[PDB]
Design a protein around this ligand. Structure first.
Ligand code: CL
Ligand code: CL
Ligand code: CL
Ligand code: CL
Ligand code: MG
Ligand code: MG
Lengths: 100, 10, 274
């Protein structure tokens, strides 16, 4: 009955430039068990056509998944990743920072 | 290609 | 360099209704090439790389047959393990398996693996010699003694040293334009003032393959770890990977700091300096 809480990184596929189409990634890793809920947000709202990779795992058996969607960064728009897992008391939300 | 497992069980 | 083929299987019981959720994925090195998901409508092994689509219908029928057979074996295993660990039927539990082989730079068998976890913890693993087993606890002793009696290791060894290596070699050739190509990291440094007197230097490595990389900061020719930050290597989503390392420095002293990037795609390590 190992429970491990997910690590989260939220970032873009390519260096972000305002007005230029890109892909928004939320990489969740190091978690167990595998049931997990991941949403990408735009201005606090859930994005609808989000895809994800097939469930895989690392050497220590912890799982990883990549959730991604097409997006166009702008000066004012805010993006985030929202993750819920049995290890979390409520969903964790990480805001996208283009410099990280 | 996957192994074509007789089969072995835990 | 050496290359690897690995299959990863996850089976999760569903106590409320139905069969376990089963996901299988195949990788050559850091590239996924096939997948099976029990909750998908196709009920087929499916390609996830262009070079595997070179394979004919017989391949997909064969891999679908075998992957479904693996799913049933894991379903049986979940039931057995609930028994071994004296657990109720009410909880969800997870079996994970990984197996595969490496070929060396000589194109010959280099090593093999075959191992299981239950509920996120080591259960049983084939040892490096491919002749014996490591059992993590007493439940796994039952499995170990049964598999020793049935000479399972000898059967696995035949696959790992033979069939597995033959297929890996085939995949490497058919997919050589990507699998045998290294993508050296595209590197750059950014500068982020955090005040009039300090700034963050961030050293970026982008679009690299394979995933293994080392980024290190030095100050005046010595490794510097204090006041650094390193993120875990992460997938770009297009088959490549990304990493960055950052350090905070006094403004005006940026020239003392160097970022060093080691990757097999590079003839020699890169040194970046602001
Ligand atoms: Cl993907
Ligand atoms: Cl080698
Ligand atoms: Cl060993
Ligand atoms: Cl290509
Ligand atoms: Mg989800
Ligand atoms: Mg075989």
């Amino acid at each position: 009955m190992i429970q491990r809480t997910p690590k989260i990184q939220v970032y873009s596929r390519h260096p972000a430039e305002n007005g230029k189409s890109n892909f928004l990634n939320c990489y969740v890793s190091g978690f167990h068990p595998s049931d997990i809920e991941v949403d990408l947000l735009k201005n606090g709202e859930r994005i609808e056509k989000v895809e994800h990779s097939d469930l895989s795992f690392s050497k220590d058996w912890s799982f990883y998944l990549l959730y991604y969607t097409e997006f166009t960064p702008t000066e004012k728009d805010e993006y985030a990743c929202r993750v819920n897992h049995v290890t979390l008391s409520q969903p964790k939300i990480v805001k996208w920072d283009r410099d990280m | 290609a996957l192994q074509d497992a007789k089969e072995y069980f835990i | 360099g050496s290359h690897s083929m690995r299959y990863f299987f996850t089976s999760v019981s569903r106590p409320g209704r139905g069969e376990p959720r089963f996901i299988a994925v195949g990788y050559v090195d850091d590239t996924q090439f096939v997948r099976f998901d029990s909750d998908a409508a196709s009920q087929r092994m499916e390609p996830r790389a262009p070079w595997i689509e070179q394979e004919g219908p017989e391949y997909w029928d064969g891999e679908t047959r075998k992957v479904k057979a693996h799913s049933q074996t894991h379903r049986v295993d979940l039931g057995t393990l609930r028994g071994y660990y004296n657990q109720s039927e009410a909880g969800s539990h997870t079996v994970q398996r990984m197996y595969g082989c490496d070929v060396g730079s000589d194109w010959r068998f280099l090593r093999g693996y075959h191992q299981y976890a239950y509920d996120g913890k080591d259960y049983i693993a084939l040892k490096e010699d491919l002749r014996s087993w490591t059992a993590a606890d007493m439940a796994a002793q039952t499995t170990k003694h049964k598999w020793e009696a049935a000479h399972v290791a000898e059967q696995l060894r035949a696959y790992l040293e033979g069939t597995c290596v033959e297929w890996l070699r085939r995949y490497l050739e058919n997919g050589k334009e990507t699998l045998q190509r290294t993508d050296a990291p595209k590197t750059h440094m950014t500068h982020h003032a955090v005040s009039d007197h300090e700034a963050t230097l961030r050293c970026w490595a982008l679009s690299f393959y394979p995933a293994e990389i080392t980024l290190t900061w030095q100050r005046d020719g010595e490794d510097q770890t204090q006041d650094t930050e390193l993120v875990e290597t992460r997938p770009a989503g297009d088959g490549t990977f990304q990493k960055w390392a950052a350090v905070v420095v006094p403004s005006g002293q940026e020239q003392r700091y160097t970022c060093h990037v080691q990757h097999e795609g590079l003839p020699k390590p890169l040194t970046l300096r602001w």
